[PDB]
Symmetry: D2
Subunit: 255 residues, 4 copies
């Protein structure tokens, strides 16, 4: 029988990695309910970042902050579900998923999002930096939250996720203030762009938009976008600062 030849020829230029997206999640369960759920349940993730001040995190034997690998990076974890981004879908296929332990909650009708611990965030920066250096096609726009890829079925990582902080650590996409201001200028002078240009702009950035956009959808689109890039207010309303941030991101990060 034949032994495969791995030495005589190797591809150099025309190839890549399978993974190009990095997705952030909150668990909305305490540590113990999270591991169980993400290992033996109906969903998994590549990494689970626990919150050290979690009574069942201590109850399980743990002390300080750590990072847990649940599925190997080369394998498909089930974390994204039905999703889209940058003209791809079924994002489980092409992504690594990070789950963060956080008691975000819950649809009591009302969404309530608690802070993240600091050790968690320092872990997340270390982790994602480790990953990005190893996957050349996960460019800034491709570090996303579950809510960007599943508008608006999901609401993680949430408005407590310090995206700009991550960006300053070289993790993810953020705009330049000068550029944002100029678009704002800007829209306050000749007015907000037609909804057509906006939809186009959102698609352009990465959002997987339906063929026709509901008023309720558009709300959820803005909300998701604001929860990520304009978290001071994410009521889902089209103001000029929102439109400005979008346009600035597109300018900074085009095709």
């Amino acid at each position: 029988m034949l032994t495969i030849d791995y030495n005589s020829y190797r591809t150099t230029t025309p190839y890549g990695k399978r993974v190009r997206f990095l997705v952030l999640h909150y668990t909305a369960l305490d540590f113990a309910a999270s591991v169980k759920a993400l290992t033996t349940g109906a969903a998994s993730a590549h990494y689970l970042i626990p919150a050290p001040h979690d009574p069942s995190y201590k109850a399980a034997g743990f002390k300080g902050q750590r990072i847990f690998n649940l599925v190997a990076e080369e394998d498909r974890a089930w974390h994204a579900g039905v999703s889209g981004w940058a003209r791809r879908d079924n994002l489980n296929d092409t992504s690594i998923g990070i789950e963060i332990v956080n008691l975000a909650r819950d649809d009591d009708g009302v969404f309530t999002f608690p802070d993240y611990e600091r050790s968690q965030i320092n872990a997340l920066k270390q982790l994602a930096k480790n990953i990005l250096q190893r996957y050349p096609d996960m460019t800034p726009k491709n570090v996303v939250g579950h809510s960007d890829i599943a508008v608006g079925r999901k609401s993680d990582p949430g408005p407590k996720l310090p995206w700009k902080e991550l960006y300053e650590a070289g993790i993810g996409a953020w705009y330049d203030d000068a550029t944002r201001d100029r678009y704002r200028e800007g829209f306050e002078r000749d007015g907000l762009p037609p909804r057509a240009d906006l939809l186009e702009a959102f698609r352009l950035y990465g959002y997987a938009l339906p063929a026709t956009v509901d008023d309720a959808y558009f709300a959820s689109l803005l909300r998701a976008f604001q929860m990520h890039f304009r978290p001071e207010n994410y009521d889902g309303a089209l103001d000029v600062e929102t439109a400005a941030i979008l346009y600035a991101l597109n300018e900074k990060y085009p095709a």
Copy 2:
């Protein structure tokens, strides 16, 4: 300075492999041109199976049949291009690509030369090896490039012995009784309308466009014929083709 914990917890049930498809191509070029084009060129493939009776090949240092890895399975080779199968698309993300050296020609009309016996044996060994390590790589998921890029591609063509691979436990094929049963029914009931036919092709796995031309429909049939009714792949609708399709769908309801 945390270290990652790979020991405390390990997902069992809810996870899988990123790869679930296996795509077969022909190179349309000799060995020397293929290895160059798939290693430094515009495209690539996970594996290359050379044709031993090739001066390029012998000249390169080789004699007997072998199997070359060019891209590690875990990486993304550039072989599917714009493509779709089984409700997925961009099949480069989730497939493994096999290139077989074979001098297929598109002048204005296609000449498809036979594959060497040793190539088929190598292919059979390589596919079994892969099929055993990718649980969701079910039989309908071993496809030709022409199955996933309909009308754009004609590889691996009609000389690829699909039935032979099926007998080796590689890829989908129909039961003879089931086909005859369907052809019997269509013969006395008439063929289904295009609309239902198309649905059947979707069902099997083909990535159908929003609307279909006479032209696309032809090339869809031509593609399906090259794989499953190679004795005639003119792209014309006849009862056998439809019967084979319906036969396939019944055996593999996935």
Copy 3:
């Protein structure tokens, strides 16, 4: 920060795989005690081949023959312990381990080795063939049993392991009868080689021999070697057929 470049240059000739050895084990426990032991215990293996006629194999939910992956091939399973072969040691590092469910037993003072099921053996041939095609440096002599690499602390895969069958499937090292006979001829004419040549021969084949070989060691060396290559009798005694098989293997598979 820098993204690693995986495309500009790729090594072709001067590299290899980390793994080059394939080691066979019996579990000496029923299925249920095996999984538990090899997943949460003090030892693991890359693969676990269950025996389908095992009441707890059925009790766990299983029906027909399958193959279980416990540790990924790229990772280090703990199956070899203190071991040596072909001038390497710490074989856990460079090997893939297959555990076979089999009620081999037990040192009641007496060793008793039951047959393996046939579906198990067909599984093992399929599995090892899959592996060998993917690791170019696991040449025939490098498919070994735990007892070859740990003389004589271990007694698996045991004399019920059909090595010659595996060889005919292209898995592992076996001699040619013509060649064996010639050495036998051979020794019956001018006598068995001095113990020095024999020790040298055994080292040469792959065995990790101590600096000085006890009479009891030499027994265990022969035994292990016979359990693998001359299983009709493995009493640990130096006959001429044993010496002949050794010499033939060395001729067929030299450096």
Copy 4:
């Protein structure tokens, strides 16, 4: 035709990584010569860190600092050669190799040019990345080629800023108080005999031969000095070297 079951059971506690060592080398050649020698030559390495102020480099197409992967971490690069550390040997099996472009020279006497600042930053980033994914790659396990092939190799040499990497959380280094404490003791008690010294080197990790020459002992000291007392690596026994060693052993009793 079984498929492998990767979902039913997964080992948690009793398993690890095959890699636990990180070895640093210098190329002793410019960029163009290095990439050629490590890709098609007699040796290789997992990663190559180029020196940006190099005509070979700029000529190849590059300008800024970057990091090249040549062999996937999971594979075996050919960089350690005959070697030993921490009771293991053949370190190619269980290590990852990093080559840094640096024009070190052995005429009859060694010239070791400084590393560029950008190279050190890249190295620091690369090592942290690796250290985080290999739990048993403990600080004593980040070694120079000269630590594992004593007397055979002199890389990465005295210009490699080990303390600097230690501060980044990469590799072993001693506590100043602990060293002074040991040097104080040796100064008033006398140095230990060779026999005990050697044991201490073993303890730290060095792979010692059955018997030691004056010659080997010298090159052992020279190796250890290049790493941990670079201000003087003549290979002569003095209290500082011994103190640093004993200081290391106390901090890292692994």
